[PDB]
Scaffold this active site. Structure first.
Site, PDB file in Angstrom:
ATOM      1  N   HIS A 142       0.771  -1.133   0.028  1.00 53.15           N
ATOM      2  CA  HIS A 142      -0.105   0.198  -0.025  1.00 53.15           C
ATOM      3  C   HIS A 142       0.806   1.106  -0.004  1.00 53.15           C
ATOM      4  O   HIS A 142       0.571   2.315  -0.810  1.00 53.15           O
ATOM      5  CB  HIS A 142      -0.960   0.005   1.213  1.00 53.15           C
ATOM      6  CG  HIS A 142      -1.591   1.079   1.455  1.00 53.15           C
ATOM      7  ND1 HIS A 142      -3.143   1.312   1.295  1.00 53.15           N
ATOM      8  CD2 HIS A 142      -1.420   2.628   1.803  1.00 53.15           C
ATOM      9  CE1 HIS A 142      -3.607   2.663   1.695  1.00 53.15           C
ATOM     10  NE2 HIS A 142      -2.529   3.355   1.880  1.00 53.15           N
ATOM     11  N   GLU A 143       1.970   1.236   0.688  1.00 52.08           N
ATOM     12  CA  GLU A 143       2.668   2.091   0.985  1.00 52.08           C
ATOM     13  C   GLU A 143       3.589   2.619  -0.404  1.00 52.08           C
ATOM     14  O   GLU A 143       3.815   3.653  -0.960  1.00 52.08           O
ATOM     15  CB  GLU A 143       3.777   2.285   2.259  1.00 52.08           C
ATOM     16  CG  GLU A 143       3.009   2.240   3.423  1.00 52.08           C
ATOM     17  CD  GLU A 143       2.110   3.596   3.549  1.00 52.08           C
ATOM     18  OE1 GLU A 143       2.229   4.519   2.949  1.00 52.08           O
ATOM     19  OE2 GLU A 143       0.989   3.306   4.485  1.00 52.08           O
ATOM     20  N   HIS A 146       1.628   4.058  -2.954  1.00 52.78           N
ATOM     21  CA  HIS A 146       1.717   5.737  -2.968  1.00 52.78           C
ATOM     22  C   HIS A 146       2.743   6.363  -3.801  1.00 52.78           C
ATOM     23  O   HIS A 146       2.534   7.361  -4.353  1.00 52.78           O
ATOM     24  CB  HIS A 146       1.784   6.143  -1.749  1.00 52.78           C
ATOM     25  CG  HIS A 146       0.367   6.139  -0.856  1.00 52.78           C
ATOM     26  ND1 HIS A 146      -0.733   6.736  -1.273  1.00 52.78           N
ATOM     27  CD2 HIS A 146      -0.060   5.542   0.358  1.00 52.78           C
ATOM     28  CE1 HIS A 146      -1.694   6.400  -0.550  1.00 52.78           C
ATOM     29  NE2 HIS A 146      -1.335   5.983   0.627  1.00 52.78           N
ATOM     30  N   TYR A 157      -3.890  14.581  -2.655  1.00 53.38           N
ATOM     31  CA  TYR A 157      -4.145  13.824  -1.439  1.00 53.38           C
ATOM     32  C   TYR A 157      -5.329  14.467  -0.748  1.00 53.38           C
ATOM     33  O   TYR A 157      -5.141  14.799   0.410  1.00 53.38           O
ATOM     34  CB  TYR A 157      -3.085  13.558  -0.410  1.00 53.38           C
ATOM     35  CG  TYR A 157      -3.150  12.278   0.246  1.00 53.38           C
ATOM     36  CD1 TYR A 157      -2.986  10.903  -0.399  1.00 53.38           C
ATOM     37  CD2 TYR A 157      -3.233  12.331   1.749  1.00 53.38           C
ATOM     38  CE1 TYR A 157      -3.337   9.817   0.391  1.00 53.38           C
ATOM     39  CE2 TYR A 157      -3.415  10.999   2.566  1.00 53.38           C
ATOM     40  CZ  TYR A 157      -3.293   9.891   1.854  1.00 53.38           C
ATOM     41  OH  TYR A 157      -3.398   8.516   2.225  1.00 53.38           O
ATOM     42  N   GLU A 166      -6.043   6.759  -2.282  1.00 54.94           N
ATOM     43  CA  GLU A 166      -6.116   5.597  -1.331  1.00 54.94           C
ATOM     44  C   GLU A 166      -6.527   4.514  -1.663  1.00 54.94           C
ATOM     45  O   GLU A 166      -5.968   3.236  -1.347  1.00 54.94           O
ATOM     46  CB  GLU A 166      -6.837   6.150   0.049  1.00 54.94           C
ATOM     47  CG  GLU A 166      -6.477   6.738   0.899  1.00 54.94           C
ATOM     48  CD  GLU A 166      -5.290   5.785   1.511  1.00 54.94           C
ATOM     49  OE1 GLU A 166      -5.373   4.785   2.240  1.00 54.94           O
ATOM     50  OE2 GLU A 166      -4.018   6.127   1.263  1.00 54.94           O
ATOM     51  N   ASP A 226     -10.088  14.245   7.632  1.00 53.33           N
ATOM     52  CA  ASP A 226      -9.321  13.325   6.860  1.00 53.33           C
ATOM     53  C   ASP A 226      -8.928  13.845   5.376  1.00 53.33           C
ATOM     54  O   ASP A 226      -9.066  13.078   4.591  1.00 53.33           O
ATOM     55  CB  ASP A 226      -9.994  11.930   6.844  1.00 53.33           C
ATOM     56  CG  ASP A 226      -9.138  10.523   6.425  1.00 53.33           C
ATOM     57  OD1 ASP A 226      -7.863  10.580   6.248  1.00 53.33           O
ATOM     58  OD2 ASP A 226      -9.887   9.875   5.562  1.00 53.33           O
ATOM     59  N   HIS A 231      -9.533   8.279   3.166  1.00 56.18           N
ATOM     60  CA  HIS A 231      -9.383   7.068   4.043  1.00 56.18           C
ATOM     61  C   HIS A 231     -10.721   6.539   4.245  1.00 56.18           C
ATOM     62  O   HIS A 231     -11.004   5.268   4.584  1.00 56.18           O
ATOM     63  CB  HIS A 231      -8.752   6.858   5.285  1.00 56.18           C
ATOM     64  CG  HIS A 231      -7.287   7.434   4.988  1.00 56.18           C
ATOM     65  ND1 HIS A 231      -6.821   8.632   5.542  1.00 56.18           N
ATOM     66  CD2 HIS A 231      -6.240   6.609   4.658  1.00 56.18           C
ATOM     67  CE1 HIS A 231      -5.588   8.499   5.221  1.00 56.18           C
ATOM     68  NE2 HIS A 231      -5.294   7.478   4.736  1.00 56.18           N
TER      69      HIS A 231
HETATM   70  O1  NX6 Z   1      -2.565   8.891   5.006  1.00 55.65           O
HETATM   71  C1  NX6 Z   1      -1.208   8.470   5.161  1.00 55.65           C
HETATM   72  O2  NX6 Z   1      -0.359   8.879   4.185  1.00 55.65           O
HETATM   73  C2  NX6 Z   1      -0.654   7.656   6.311  1.00 55.65           C
HETATM   74  C3  NX6 Z   1      -1.247   6.232   5.820  1.00 55.65           C
HETATM   75  N1  NX6 Z   1      -0.823   5.333   6.968  1.00 55.65           N
HETATM   76  C4  NX6 Z   1      -1.554   4.059   7.465  1.00 55.65           C
HETATM   77  O3  NX6 Z   1      -2.704   3.985   7.250  1.00 55.65           O
HETATM   78  O4  NX6 Z   1      -0.850   3.523   8.286  1.00 55.65           O
HETATM   79  C5  NX6 Z   1      -1.553   1.974   8.519  1.00 55.65           C
HETATM   80  C6  NX6 Z   1      -1.991   1.304   7.451  1.00 55.65           C
HETATM   81  C7  NX6 Z   1      -1.176   1.445   6.158  1.00 55.65           C
HETATM   82  C8  NX6 Z   1      -1.763   0.690   5.013  1.00 55.65           C
HETATM   83  C9  NX6 Z   1      -2.605  -0.240   5.222  1.00 55.65           C
HETATM   84  C10 NX6 Z   1      -3.279  -0.517   6.573  1.00 55.65           C
HETATM   85  C11 NX6 Z   1      -2.940   0.427   7.580  1.00 55.65           C
HETATM   86  C12 NX6 Z   1      -1.719   5.819   4.531  1.00 55.65           C
HETATM   87  O5  NX6 Z   1      -0.803   4.932   4.003  1.00 55.65           O
HETATM   88  O6  NX6 Z   1      -2.962   6.024   4.009  1.00 55.65           O
HETATM   89 ZN    ZN Z   2      -2.612   5.197   2.059  1.00 51.57          ZN
END
Ligand code: NX6
Ligand code: ZN
Ligand code: CA
Ligand code: CA
Ligand code: CA
Ligand code: CA
Length: 316
Positions: A142-143, A146, A157, A166, A226, A231
């Site tokens: 997921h990261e 991004h 975002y 997302e 948010d 999210h």
């Molecule tokens: O908003 C942001 O950039 C940080 C946020 N981070 C986040 O939610 O960390 C926990 C998590 C990440 C991926 C899947 C499940 C839980 C995001 O990546 O969306």
């Molecule tokens: Zn994310």
């Protein structure tokens, strides 16, 4: 660093044993020279300074409790790299084999992971809401996704663009989880979320409403929390993706599933060719429809299922 490519062994956050590509030069470092310009994993040592220090180990064995999040961050970044390469012919997140960097042990009791514009960062969690977040393959992918989005569509975002951003990360995180075939599902974060509660997760793609997220446009969040619900409203798109892949009947609208490989191809193409920084849900629908048309033809089942799915979540 300059050194000799080797292979270490260790245990991940969930206690599974796995091999990892490392580099030897006096110490063994978490540096994988076999993928692009390298995959590098760092120790943030409970601090917030980044990246911290390149992970160094004396014997190339990573079985200490403190080692576990680094092992998984390193390994799952590698798996994600392999997914984008083997499945989408994409070389790292920028398409030109950019070095992938991750830091673990970020801060103290930090219930979060993120992409900071230059690298991935993982908290250890507080042991109640999360265990170390690199323990989840869908989290890692997921990261990294991004980063992929930033370098392609560049979806900003906030609001609907943000929610698409997302959802894309949730979609590909899940598709990477299926690619690795390690207990795959359409849930998000289940491997590292709430160790004291079995069967739950942070989000569900198959039924977003299970965790409070909208599964239809009419139920979209219109407030300012948010970043305008990035999210939250991602559930609408997540549901659509799920339907495209798996099929189903949703608010009385039926969808014939075309499977995850085709889901991936359609959304990867939409992401890399038609989405823009300010695309909204409607424009995403058009992009996915054009992608499926490109790949399978205007009159295909693929195109028809894309349309049915967006219809089902109320996106025209
Ligand atoms: O908003 C942001 O950039 C940080 C946020 N981070 C986040 O939610 O960390 C926990 C998590 C990440 C991926 C899947 C499940 C839980 C995001 O990546 O969306
Ligand atoms: Zn994310
Ligand atoms: Ca060791
Ligand atoms: Ca799973
Ligand atoms: Ca999952
Ligand atoms: Ca749990």
């Amino acid at each position: 660093i300059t050194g000799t490519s080797t292979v270490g062994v260790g245990r991940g956050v969930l206690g599974d044993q796995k091999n990892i590509n490392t580099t030897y030069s006096t110490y063994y470092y978490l540096q994988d020279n076999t993928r692009g310009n390298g995959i590098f994993t760092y120790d943030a040592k409970y601090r917030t300074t980044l990246p911290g220090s390149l992970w160094a180990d004396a014997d190339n064995q990573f079985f200490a409790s403190y080692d576990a999040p680094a092992v998984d961050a390193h390994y799952y970044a590698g798996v994600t790299y392999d997914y984008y390469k083997n499945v989408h012919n994409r070389l790292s997140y920028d398409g030109n084999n950019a070095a992938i960097r991750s830091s673990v042990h970020y801060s103290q009791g930090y219930n979060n992971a993120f992409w900071n514009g230059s690298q991935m960062v993982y908290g250890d969690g507080d042991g109640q809401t999360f265990i170390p977040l690199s323990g989840g393959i869908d989290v890692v992918a997921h990261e990294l996704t991004h980063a992929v989005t930033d370098y392609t569509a560049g979806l900003i975002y906030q609001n609907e663009s943000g929610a698409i951003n997302e959802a894309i990360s949730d979609i590909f995180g899940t598709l990477v989880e299926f690619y690795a075939n390690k207990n795959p599902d359409w849930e998000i974060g289940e491997d590292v979320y709430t160790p004291g509660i079995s069967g739950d997760s942070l989000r569900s793609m198959s039924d977003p409403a299970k965790y409070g997220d909208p599964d239809h446009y009419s139920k979209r969040y219109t407030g300012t929390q948010d970043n305008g619900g990035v999210h939250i409203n991602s559930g609408i798109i997540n549901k659509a993706a799920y339907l495209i892949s798996q099929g189903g009947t949703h608010y009385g609208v039926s969808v014939v599933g075309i499977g995850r490989d085709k889901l991936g191809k359609i959304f990867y193409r939409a992401l890399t060719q038609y989405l823009t920084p300010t695309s909204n849900f409607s424009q995403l629908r058009a992009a996915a429809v054009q992608s499926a048309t490109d790949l399978y033809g205007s009159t295909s089942q693929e195109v028809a299922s894309v349309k049915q799915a967006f219809d089902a979540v109320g996106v025209k």
